[PDB]
Ligand binder design. Structure first.
Ligand SMILES: NC(=O)c1ccc[n+]([C@@H]2O[C@H](COP(=O)([O-])OP(=O)(O)OC[C@H]3O[C@@H](n4cnc5c(N)ncnc54)[C@H](O)[C@@H]3O)[C@@H](O)[C@H]2O)c1
Ligand SMILES: NC(=O)c1ccc[n+]([C@@H]2O[C@H](COP(=O)([O-])OP(=O)(O)OC[C@H]3O[C@@H](n4cnc5c(N)ncnc54)[C@H](O)[C@@H]3O)[C@@H](O)[C@H]2O)c1
Ligand SMILES: NC(=O)c1ccc[n+]([C@@H]2O[C@H](COP(=O)([O-])OP(=O)(O)OC[C@H]3O[C@@H](n4cnc5c(N)ncnc54)[C@H](O)[C@@H]3O)[C@@H](O)[C@H]2O)c1
Ligand SMILES: NC(=O)c1ccc[n+]([C@@H]2O[C@H](COP(=O)([O-])OP(=O)(O)OC[C@H]3O[C@@H](n4cnc5c(N)ncnc54)[C@H](O)[C@@H]3O)[C@@H](O)[C@H]2O)c1
Ligand SMILES: NC(=O)c1ccc[n+]([C@@H]2O[C@H](COP(=O)([O-])OP(=O)(O)OC[C@H]3O[C@@H](n4cnc5c(N)ncnc54)[C@H](O)[C@@H]3O)[C@@H](O)[C@H]2O)c1
Ligand SMILES: NC(=O)c1ccc[n+]([C@@H]2O[C@H](COP(=O)([O-])OP(=O)(O)OC[C@H]3O[C@@H](n4cnc5c(N)ncnc54)[C@H](O)[C@@H]3O)[C@@H](O)[C@H]2O)c1
Ligand SMILES: O=C(O)c1cc2ccccc2c(Cc2c(O)c(C(=O)O)cc3ccccc23)c1O
Ligand SMILES: O=C(O)c1cc2ccccc2c(Cc2c(O)c(C(=O)O)cc3ccccc23)c1O
Ligand SMILES: O=C(O)c1cc2ccccc2c(Cc2c(O)c(C(=O)O)cc3ccccc23)c1O
Lengths: 551, 551, 551
């Protein structure tokens, strides 16, 4: 393009970083302020402005405003201050922004697909400008993290997620497509006000919803290829869990809550087996809550035990689960699903109804809380957990902070610094009365899903297996240095996630090429250089055409 | 255009007012939320949101945000609530927004012309997309109303001014071009910070500034025609006053502060001569401050007296002026300019140094304050003014409110409701202890410059005369009904300015065709229908192409 | 535009005349052959290629091919060799090309409007890209000069005509719009073959045809303005003659056959009155054939006599007409139209049935043949014409050459060089046996309609009067030098028509401003400079944007 469109397009826009020659010979002279800046000056200006701001919503509005103007500047700002701005971009700020401000974006981002557009989804998909997209993030709006049902307003969530894809992994922004599929909303507040921009109907729970999802996946893979990575995001637990099982084999789909969270938990455990002398195989594990997330975590733990020489049937005997009714045992009154069968064992002597006595009798070395029904972990639970184990491992993986079973202060005060605590929700460092300030391990999916997504995209993988996340967990555990392990950190520092994500991608890429899951040939000689070439870089590219004089 | 560009262009964007057929056959299906709205729903949504907001800056950011997305919706919102949103758009909110937020706009508006771009201004002008523009507003940034020197940040002022052109007069938005000519800045705050987007030099006061203005006017009239209306806005008093004299004859230029303010003051006086039985000719007038603004007001008053039968030399004897040094009289110690000569008369007996004794001895029937050095009108001045005259006329035309000579409460309390008070600055209604709440006449240029601009544009006028504003003042006085005159209102209500402006245009148009100042031929048979057809209307236009089946 | 579109657009295409810098910085590097040429080299190449060609059809195909590739080069080639290439472009070559080759053009030229598109003509007109067009040429296809009914294939005729507008007058190519209105065809050859691209119906002679013409004119003047010049070209004689009368007052329409031919004939007579001592007023004129063309010529001759002091009723007594039945006299058996009444006089003594005895008895000084029924002028007619008059004036204005009444050889051999012969059809020089080679005056409309069209366009004239063509005829007679008059030439040389046309425009422009028929104000001080600035010039314009370095 030339002239004004070149400024309007966020991909090609440089702002006042257009050099004088580019302005003069591209038609931008007089349309821009006289100052000529670099990308550093532009980044410093926005960093100072963000530092002046005091609330996450103001920062979110500011950064999402600069995203629509200059994308390279936006990602430069993100990568410059990724640790601080990542909560502003993805969680929990974007959900709250969708709740309060509604629709913030001034430009068409992604595709809105209705239940009224059934039978014609391919026509909608054909409207997207970019011909090659590699990653698709789909939102229903039903279950926003901590905000509930937001209807069609939950479109900012995929945008915030794809921002993390580009900022951490390096996936090209134009290869990403955010999609919102709206079938109504259940909350009455949006159904009542006349200015809600979605359908004025309750959420469609009939077969039309399933058919719409089928048609959408078929259309998107028809236009963009069978290896397109499709991620179902903020669907209902029922919908997301069953959709992953349905589309797992036919399409390239992976779920962060089931699989990314399992990878993060396994990485935390593999780091704990380095902090503590005893390995992962020896120590018994107890799960609070039995569900698809708990089953995924336990399956991945069993895989990790198996690759270390333990028999699969023997490895499963170590993992214990605590359902809502009680300990998951043979002969239990409540029904046990087929998937929960491997981890259901012969009943112990006590057969305890309460989780506390289950901890007391089973003597679990590791405790993992995924139930997310509240503060299920109690001070009695934690002191008991300390009683059996010299260095107990406590995981509170359910988020938001309200749903988390344990708090960092509770874990580090009930146990006088002996425990290893890892939680999905962010917690401040705990300062004991004696001293020895402890920062609790905070493991979120952003460690896993960017690098895994990049590795899957680069290798043209069509089916993502469970062991891909095992390799991702091992890779993530690998970047921890011995000094950090001495400090007791379970996860790599979040300030340098990019170098983490790329490294993870490398390892995953190698695995994908080792087991014939990668369809991009010829095989790279070395995977590190291969992935490092492909990552998108936010540096501006000169638009000056080559000018010379003929000999 | 088709597809995504159709949404990105503010001129052609409809938002969710795109009908389903337009979305389907224009490529917008899936790029817009499923809801289909009308222009009324969109206007109500923004009106409610603006009503929720509590500060002028928030409202300004919101409305200028919707301007960049949908221009027809923006002007519909303005015309719906013109009285409330006009201070938000033009004064004093836009200057304060430029002061605090800097550059708000996310899209290229107008042209930035540097002193470093001398010799190549035509190349800059050629970069503007629209081939036909009728009105150009030029800002220097030197003298923002109440904020001082803002440098290149004073670009929002022409945008806010052109918004009033389109909202009140009905001039097409694409016919307007805002231009900022930046030659440096004098304030050290902008010269010190590294993120100022202008030139890092003090304001260029040399001959290069004059040559740049000459070159800019030549280039703009070369590209867009000699009848292009060019308005110098927020220049320094010296620069603006001398530029109007220099370019008045060669180009189509008019100045609101010199000529629009004079028209508003004369309209107020012509309305007072209806409120008070005695006419304009009889009553003596005293001016506080002698300058180009005061000279313009006095010249226009003399013209009004002359058209009513009074001799010009005899009419000039009635207007008196009070310079900074003292009463403007023969033999005065201080120099008297050539332009101030007609209103300089033989000295009275007292020859008073102070303004108070000048009022006491001259017995002025009307007092007009344009000096703007502060609260020059004192309680003693106002009680004296009441002493001579049963119904004194007091004008405090200098703005901002700080620079205004008098306050509405002072005028209406020192004079027990007898005075007629008109001021440029807005004042709340005055409630006396006895009762009889008085609203002070508030006459701003927005009465005059939209209608006069529309009339000049429609008739292809090349030279705007002084008597055009005399006709505008008479027209503005005409819309006042007898009920409003009984209420004591000097100006028409501001809530229905559009019907005022069009009416003014009509009258001005007639005058332009009466005196061979209009170059658009053939002459319209009736001017009212002629102007009413031409005004831009904010109603959306269907983009459905005509579809039929051949016989 | 930039890159490949810049080459594809004929308006902006330069071919290999793009300089190396333009190619490099406009994206054309590698898309063009390495050679860099000028406007002269390109013109010389095409001139040599045309000189190699031997038939008019090959030349027509070649030049109309270069028109679609480079318009500036095409018009440079035309203006370089206008006399030779004008018959190739307009007449009689383009009609024969439409007859044989059908549709030659590879690009959309003009608009095709059907009788099946009635009720929606404005939708068709809105499809034309150019927003400002000044001249519109409309063809029906019914009466092609010498080829008969060609149906929709007669679309090349307006294109060839507008080529003459641009080449001779200098009207901008993008201001011209060729329109073909097809209502069927009468010839069975086109109705029979399955590949005819028009309607498969006989020509619509019902009221729908008239309504379609009305709707088309209304739509075209609605989109492009009331002063748009619309020219009905190659309509049937009935249709064209009645349409000129119907739309003459309401729209800006003029007809070459009625009015241009009359202007050319009057110019020839005014040149003859310089070649022969006696003036136009003295000499009696006899017309062969009485019709709208003959009535137009006679009316214009009467106007010329009147402006020279002769009374209108007395001037009309000199012009005589010979209808099909016989001499046009009082009491004639055949009906006489209202328009033919002024030139119908009291019967002479003979009242001759044959044209020959009419010449013998009336003793006409001038004879004009417009009937076009064949070789109506006979050797007996010409020898009789020589018998009465020492230097007879013979005009054979009907074309093609087959329809012409007289031949140059017949006129110059039956009269031993004494006669002055002017004909519409082209004739070679006549070489008598004694010697004194005589070239016959060849007066075609191309003398008149380009200059008159340019003058009408420049002055924004809304109604073209009859006396405009009187001024055009006088102007055309004026360029003849005394040397050419001594040579006996009735018309200026055709090799320098451009300097003729511009001159004609000048004079016409002056007349339009003298009689308040011109609506473009302010009035130019001198009309010559005014028109000379406005003429389109075929010189290439550099596309290099201005590049400089800031001080
Ligand atoms: N100015 C530009 O925007 C520009 C210029 C040149 C090339 N490209 C891109 O290079 C691509 C060529 O593909 P390739 O030769 O690199 O294939 P590849 O063999 O290197 O990689 C295999 C797959 O990985 C995809 N991929 C590679 N890098 C990616 C990234 N950073 N983010 C998301 N997906 C990525 C590729 O699209 C490809 O499908 C073009 O299709 C085009 O998308 C873009
Ligand atoms: N996106 C994430 O961060 C993420 C990912 C995975 C898991 N989780 C967490 O997992 C937990 C639930 O996920 P899920 O997939 O298992 O949902 P689910 O619907 O599949 O099942 C939830 C399980 O929790 C058990 N449970 C509920 N209340 C209990 C109680 N008071 N006492 C004991 N057990 C109880 C139930 O037996 C049930 O099986 C939540 O904390 C959730 O936030 C979060
Ligand atoms: N979809 C569109 O945007 C669209 C469609 C048709 C016509 N137009 C406009 O109509 C114009 C035709 O001019 P005209 O026949 O009306 O001239 P006119 O004789 O009616 O008026 C004379 C002058 O007044 C100008 N003018 C008229 N209305 C104006 C307005 N509301 N705001 C600012 N200037 C105005 C005109 O540009 C013209 O120069 C086109 O040049 C084009 O600008 C726009
Ligand atoms: N844009 C507007 O709203 C507008 C328009 C016209 C005039 N004004 C007002 O006119 C007044 C000045 O405008 P100007 O064009 O005359 O400026 P100016 O520079 O041309 O001259 C100002 C005049 O004010 C006189 N003066 C200054 N201080 C005085 C004092 N203490 N006592 C008596 N006289 C004093 C001076 O003699 C001087 O002649 C200001 O209130 C200004 O705000 C405002
Ligand atoms: N690169 C370009 O193509 C380019 C650049 C600048 C201006 N222009 C043209 O100049 C026009 C400005 O009009 P103006 O100021 O000259 O009006 P004008 O006062 O000079 O003339 C009056 C009328 O004559 C018309 N006209 C003038 N010259 C003509 C020509 N050679 N052929 C056909 N019609 C002609 C004009 O369109 C106008 O309507 C623009 O509308 C635009 O059409 C074109
Ligand atoms: N485009 C041009 O070059 C042009 C322009 C004007 C006139 N003409 C010529 O004018 C002549 C006809 O044009 P028109 O407008 O008068 O058509 P028309 O239909 O209006 O009338 C033709 C006239 O010719 C008369 N006529 C026909 N045959 C005759 C005959 N054998 N003897 C005597 N008179 C006869 C008839 O009385 C009739 O009135 C043709 O030569 C035609 O080519 C040509
Ligand atoms: O990158 C871009 O396309 C970009 C485009 C711009 C266009 C015009 C003016 C400033 C621009 C800036 C800098 C900038 C800003 O961006 C912002 C903002 O975004 O709020 C505010 C500014 C305030 C004062 C000065 C500069 C500011 C940009 O960076
Ligand atoms: O006109 C336009 O082009 C326009 C374009 C839109 C595109 C997508 C969504 C809403 C749009 C709205 C409505 C709208 C808004 O415009 C805004 C806003 O402007 O802040 C906020 C909204 C919040 C919730 C729902 C609708 C909102 C528009 O009007
Ligand atoms: O003006 C133009 O856009 C133009 C565009 C051209 C593009 C490619 C090659 C020649 C071009 C020529 C020159 C040219 C020709 O044009 C033609 C032709 O037109 O038949 C034939 C050629 C044969 C040999 C060499 C050059 C010839 C042009 O002029």
């Amino acid at each position: 393009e030339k002239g004004k469109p070149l400024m309007l397009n966020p991909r090609t826009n440089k702002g006042m970083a257009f050099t004088l020659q580019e302005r003069q010979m591209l038609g931008l002279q007089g349309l821009l302020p006289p100052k000529i800046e670099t990308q550093d000056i532009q980044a410093l200006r926005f960093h100072r402005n963000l530092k002046k701001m005091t609330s996450p919503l103001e920062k979110y509005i500011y950064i999402m405003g600069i995203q629509e103007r200059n994308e390279k500047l936006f990602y430069r700002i993100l990568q410059d201050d990724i640790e601080s701005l990542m909560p502003i971009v993805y969680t929990p700020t974007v959900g709250l922004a969708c709740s309060q401000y509604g629709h913030i974006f001034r430009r068409p981002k992604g595709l809105f697909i209705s239940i009224s557009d059934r039978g014609h989804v391919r026509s909608i998909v054909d409207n997207w400008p970019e011909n090659h997209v590699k990653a698709v993030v789909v939102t229903d709006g039903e279950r926003i993290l901590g905000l509930g049902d937001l209807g069609v307003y939950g479109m900012g969530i995929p945008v915030g997620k794809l921002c993390l894809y580009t900022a951490c992994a390096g996936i090209r922004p134009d290869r990403c497509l955010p999609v919102c599929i709206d079938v109504g909303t259940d909350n009455i507040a949006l159904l009542k006000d006349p200015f809600y921009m979605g359908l004025y109907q309750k959420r469609d729970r009939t077969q039309q919803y399933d058919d719409l999802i089928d048609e959408f996946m078929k259309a998107i893979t028809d236009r963009y290829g069978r290896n397109t990575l499709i991620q179902f995001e903020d669907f209902g637990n029922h919908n997301a869990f069953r959709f992953l099982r349905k589309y797992r084999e036919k399409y390239c789909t992976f779920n962060d809550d089931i699989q990314g969270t399992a990878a993060v938990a396994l990485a935390g455990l593999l780091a704990a087996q380095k902090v503590i002398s005893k390995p992962i195989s020896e120590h018994k594990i107890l799960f609070l809550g039995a569900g698809e997330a708990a089953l995924g975590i336990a399956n991945l733990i069993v895989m990790s035990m198996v690759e270390n020489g333990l028999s699969e049937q023997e490895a499963q005997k170590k993992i214990w689960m605590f359902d809502k009714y009680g300990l998951l045992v043979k002969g239990r009154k409540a029904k046990i699903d087929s998937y929960q069968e491997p981890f259901t064992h012969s009943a112990p002597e006590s057969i305890p109804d309460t989780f506390e006595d289950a901890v007391n009798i089973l003597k679990p070395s590791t405790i993992i809380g995924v139930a997310g029904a509240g503060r299920l972990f109690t001070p009695d639970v934690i002191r008991a957990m300390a009683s059996i184990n010299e260095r107990p491992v406590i995981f509170a993986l359910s988020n938001p902070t309200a749903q988390a079973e344990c708090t960092a202060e509770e874990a580090y005060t009930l146990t006088e610094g002996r425990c290893l605590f890892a939680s999905g929700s962010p917690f401040g460092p705990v300062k004991l009365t004696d001293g020895r300030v402890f920062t609790p391990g905070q493991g979120n999916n952003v460690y896993i899903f960017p690098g895994v997504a990049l590795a899957v995209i680069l290798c043209n993988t069509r089916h993502i297996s469970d062991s891909v996340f095992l390799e991702a967990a091992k890779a993530l555990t690998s970047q921890l240095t011995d000094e950090e392990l001495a400090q007791g950190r379970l996860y790599p520092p979040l300030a340098n996630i990019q170098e983490v994500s790329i490294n993870i991608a490398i390892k995953v890429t190698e695995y994908l090429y080792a087991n014939k899951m990668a369809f991009r040939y010829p095989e790279p000689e070395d995977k590190a250089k291969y992935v490092k070439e492909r990552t998108w870089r936010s540096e501006y590219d000169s638009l000056l055409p080559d000018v010379y004089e003929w000999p």
